[PDB]
Design a protein around this ligand. Structure first.
Ligand SMILES: [Mn+2]
Ligand SMILES: [Mn+2]
Ligand SMILES: [Mn+2]
Ligand SMILES: [Mn+2]
Lengths: 308, 308
């Protein structure tokens, strides 16, 4: 029996790391057929982490999952998952996100916790079972936590994430702030990249009531680096929205040095979500928010605007 | 800060017990606004357990859950939950079932394990946390486990359910086989009850792909006690299917002594699910299975038939 372990499409550092980490967990637990996979490209940020701790990228999933045992990490929504996910047998989910568009035939292990990072939950699982946390594995856990939490500044970050990171740094042999900022910087180069690349780099679809929304995330050293390409961005966001039948396309731009975030929003349901945010720039194509609240989570806020 | 804790509509013993057990857990955890509720009638089986351990029945939920904190036990599918569940904020789910028709705006705690009973999971939460298990609480846990497992003979039963029961017996101060058989017998009187009563006693709706299916469970001393009323059963099942627009209505009849089960199946997708079982008799309106495979679970097998 093989078991396929993977994170979401357009994987982020958490998605790649958690797949490798959970494959380790399964193997230490005695499940030798467990194997990590990815559903997309390894980003520059994630490559920095993999290179630092000398871990190879997981294999790109090309197998049909029909009748196969599957473990999902860092996602549950089927449209974020493998093309053949609906034909798989999902044994286990480990995740830190909202639940939607998820259905199984029978019972399964499902573990979600409202923490800042999937690797934090996996850290706790290793702990609970008393399994070895190798230095590389600790490095990937720490990388994931720094990535998802943005060096502990995102509204999703919790003290469990901070505590896990503090306990992992000596195992990984790494200074959190120094390594962390280097890692974040390694995925923050935008000006020489195409609009198509930026909008697909870290981008996921969401099932929100009757609607399907696309959300892309871009890190930069300066918000304006990205945001004065607004016109070209909007154009591509509208084109993709039509081609994929999205009801909404949100671009979240985040300053890694500053921790400030803004959103650029396009699509059929644009005006409805605009009411939920501080609109600073608007037109027929799009709206641009002022710098977003540090404490409120964006995904739930958008969901509530579309459903409520 | 209220938090409503409840099980599914037409609650079984697991659904009633687990709500009370989880309310205790929350109070014990420090959450003082936590309260147990029920969404329907207390069955004869459940009443026997409540009387044995002097636990009153939880309050019938009548409040609108709009904007309220909720914890679900022993279910997740929205059609099985409160009428206002979509307007609530689901903080926590503890369950042992398939997942479907479940969506949240934001992150949450979700704990599902593929075990025989929700109370088994709640028991593990007490053990993990080092919480004291009162003898009344231990009795409810044990009752739920005996109920869902049918005195440890159902396909869903695991060694974790057995282990937990062995340790709970001395806390509850009860003989498992003796109390268990009494409890099961108390909910197994069928010939005196109307067809309408039997089909609404332990009946839940399910989201299975494009379909909505209704499944009713009936415990009996002897399978033929119920199944000799075949035609009266079918008639009410078709009537309800038409009136509620179900694609399928399954009646599972289980012998409490030997744990043999048979299914009586009616509705639009009847032929499609008949494919997945050993059909002992059939006509235009219904099929009746032979004694169902002792290892494989019924709900997943139905779901699989309606999809693949
Ligand atoms: Mn991710
Ligand atoms: Mn993540
Ligand atoms: Mn139940
Ligand atoms: Mn149950």
């Amino acid at each position: 029996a093989k078991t396929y372990i993977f994170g979401h499409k357009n994987p982020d550092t958490d998605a790649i790391s958690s797949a490798i980490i959970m494959a380790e967990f399964e193997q230490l637990r005695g499940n030798s057929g467990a194997k990590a996979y990815r559903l997309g490209d390894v980003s520059a940020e994630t490559q920095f982490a993999l290179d630092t701790f000398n871990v190879p990228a997981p294999e790109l999933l090309t197998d049909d999952l029909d009748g196969q045992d599957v473990i999902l990490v860092d996602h549950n929504e089927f449209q974020q998952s493998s093309d053949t996910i609906a034909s798989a047998t999902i044994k286990h989910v480990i995740d830190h996100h909202r639940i939607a568009n998820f259905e199984t035939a029978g019972p399964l292990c499902y573990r979600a916790e409202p923490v800042g990072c999937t690797a934090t939950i996996l850290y706790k699982m290793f702990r609970e079972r008393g399994f070895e946390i190798k230095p590389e594995i600790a490095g990937l856990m720490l990388s994931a936590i720094i990535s998802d939490s943005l060096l502990f500044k995102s509204p999703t970050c919790t003290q469990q994430d901070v505590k896990a990171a503090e306990e992992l740094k000596d195992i990984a042999k790494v200074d959190i702030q120094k390594y962390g900022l280097d890692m974040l910087k390694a995925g923050a180069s935008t000006t020489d990249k195409s609009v198509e690349f930026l909008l697909n780099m870290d981008a996921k679809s969401f099932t929100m009531g009757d609607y399907v929304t696309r959300i892309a995330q871009v890190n930069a050293v300066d918000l304006d680096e990205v945001l004065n390409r607004k016109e070209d961005l909007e154009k591509e966001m509208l084109a993709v929205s039509a081609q994929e039948k999205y009801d909404l396309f949100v671009l979240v731009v985040t300053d890694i040095i500053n921790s400030d975030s803004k959103i650029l929003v396009v699509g059929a349901e644009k005006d409805k979500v605009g009411e939920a945010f501080n609109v600073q720039l608007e037109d027929d194509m799009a709206f641009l928010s002022g710098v977003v609240s540090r404490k409120k989570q964006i995904v739930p806020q958008i969901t509530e605007a579309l459903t409520k």
